[PDB]
């Protein structure tokens, strides 16, 4: 019974680190693109 209970409750360490890495990379990509998007509208000033 103890061996059977473990199949539906414990964490798989080999699988769980990949999502950590993937999310870490995605966050940095998002931050850089957010800064770019914020800086974009500056160019309209030269027209004035």
């Amino acid at each position: 019974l103890s061996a059977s209970r473990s199949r539906i409750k414990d964490t798989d360490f080999a699988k769980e680190t990949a999502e950590l890495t993937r999310t870490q990379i995605l966050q940095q990509a998002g931050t850089a693109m957010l800064a770019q998007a914020n800086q974009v509208p500056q160019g309209v000033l030269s027209l004035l």
Binding site: I8, T11, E19, L20, T23, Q27, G30, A37, V44
Partner: protein, 48 residues
């Protein structure tokens, strides 16, 4: 057309960043605790 009052590109990027960063909390928590079911939110019967 160039506008300054609204920045749709900037408005979007924020939503994408929040969506990407949502899951990192859950993965860190279940990787630190050592178990896959920590509240009834994750599973409905496995706790039973």
């Amino acid at each position: 057309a160039q506008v300054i009052n609204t920045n749709t590109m900037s408005l979007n990027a924020q939503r994408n960043l929040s969506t990407s960063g949502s899951s990192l909390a859950t993965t860190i928590q279940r990787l630190s605790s050592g178990s896959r079911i920590n509240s009834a939110k994750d599973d409905a019967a496995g706790l039973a």
